[PDB]
Amino acid sequence: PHMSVSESAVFAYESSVHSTNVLLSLNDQRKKDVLCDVTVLVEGQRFRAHRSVLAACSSYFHSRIVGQTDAELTVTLPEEVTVKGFEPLIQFAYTAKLILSKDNVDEVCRCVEFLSVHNIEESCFQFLKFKFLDSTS
Amino acid sequence: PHMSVSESAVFAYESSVHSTNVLLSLNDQRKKDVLCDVTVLVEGQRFRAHRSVLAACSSYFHSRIVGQTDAELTVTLPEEVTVKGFEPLIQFAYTAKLILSKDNVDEVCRCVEFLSVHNIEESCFQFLKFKFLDSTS
Numbered sequence: 070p071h072m073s074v075s076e077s078a079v080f081a082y083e084s085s086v087h088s089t090n091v092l093l094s095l096n097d098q099r100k101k102d103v104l105c106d107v108t109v110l111v112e113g114q115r116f117r118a119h120r121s122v123l124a125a126c127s128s129y130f131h132s133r134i135v136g137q138t139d140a141e142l143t144v145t146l147p148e149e150v151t152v153k154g155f156e157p158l159i160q161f162a163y164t165a166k167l168i169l170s171k172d173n174v175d176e177v178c179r180c181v182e183f184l185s186v187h188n189i190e191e192s193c194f195q196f197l198k199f200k201f202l203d204s205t206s
Numbered sequence: 207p208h209m210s211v212s213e214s215a216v217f218a219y220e221s222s223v224h225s226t227n228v229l230l231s232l233n234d235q236r237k238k239d240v241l242c243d244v245t246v247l248v249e250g251q252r253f254r255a256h257r258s259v260l261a262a263c264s265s266y267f268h269s270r271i272v273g274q275t276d277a278e279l280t281v282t283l284p285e286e287v288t289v290k291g292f293e294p295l296i297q298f299a300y301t302a303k304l305i306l307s308k309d310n311v312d313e314v315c316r317c318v319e320f321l322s323v324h325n326i327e328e329s330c331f332q333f334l335k336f337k338f339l340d341s342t343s
Contacts, residue, residue, distance in 0.1 A: 076340040080306045082329040087302040088229040090325065094262030103272065104258045106243060121241045121256050125231030135240065140277035165224040169217045188227065192219040203213040 089165070095119060096163035107134070110145040111155045118159065126162045128185040146184075154180035161189060171201035226302070232256060233300035244271070247282040248292045255296065263299045265322040283321075291317035298326060308338035 074080075098104045099118055107120040120142060123130040133144050146155070154176030161167035167189060169177055178193035180186075211217075235241045236255055244257040257279060260267040270281050283292070291313030298304035304326060306314055315330035317323075 071337055072335055073337045073339045073341060076308055076338045078307070078338065080311070080333050082298075082304040082306075082326070082333075084302045084325050087298075087325045088225040091259060091262055091299075092225040092228055095258055098258055098262070104261055106258075119256070119258050121232055121235055121243075121258075122228060124241055125228055125235070161219075161224075162228075165221045167219040169219075170215070171213055174217070188221050188224045189219070196217050196219075198209055200208055200210045201213045201215065202210045204210060 092163065092165065095122060099163055106140070106142065108141075108143045109155075109159070110143060111150050112148075112152050114152050116155070116159055118163075122162065126186055126188075128187075130184065149183050150180050151176050153177070158184070158186060158189075162186065167192065169196055174201075229300065229302065232259060236300055243277070243279065245278075245280045246292075246296070247280060248287050249285075249289050251289050253292070253296055255300075259299065263323055263325075265324075267321065286320050287317050288313050290314070295321070295323060295326075299323065304329065306333055311338075 102117045105117040105119055107118050107123065109116045109118060109123070120130075120134045120137075124134045125131075130144065134142070153173050157168055157173060157177050158180050167177075174196055178197055181189045181193050239254045242254040242256055244255050244260065246253045246255060246260070257267075257271045257274075261271045262268075267281065271279070290310050294305055294310060294314050295317050304314075311333055315334055318326045318330050
């Protein structure tokens, strides 16, 4: 026949992969420009995104976004923000992974500070402790 | 002085908590009705959400949402969907945790199937193998 359990019992199911799947679906939506709702303009280049996600990940975006009413909102970032710095940064927001090398560490980390991208302040602090010189005592 | 690293080296940072934080920020946005963009109507009750998230988590929502143009989109679910079933279900989508007991298991799991809420089909299959009777041989 079947199995049974105490009448008052409560079942629970916690997925360890769900939140990551959701984030990756949003990243896929972002790369395809489907179901997005905001455009971020950096040096003439357009980055599509979800204002909800951007507000959640950056205090700067949060204040620029919250009371906005435009279905087709555009947020223009000043010169302090560059395509070279912002690119890997929005990629982090949507993938949880932040990549850096000699040529972008400074700009990527200046943007992190300038936009206050939460889960990354520390990392940048650590990466900025190095100089890409090539150990040759 | 400082530390250095090979000129060609590449730094990477993977956050294990970021995707969960993002999901919880979206859930907070959903409970407060701030930065949401879609309303789901179930038996006269309104559930605010992010169409991006709903499309990502449910095939049914995905087809009802994608080509929509309404900034203020409303998706009405038929009688098969009930507040008792849907409630813990949208909560799962936004928290990764699905709770169930004797009184909602059937409706919550009928909705999961009806809406095709990805990361939950199996769980429901397992929970439906039980009867809440109270083991008293």
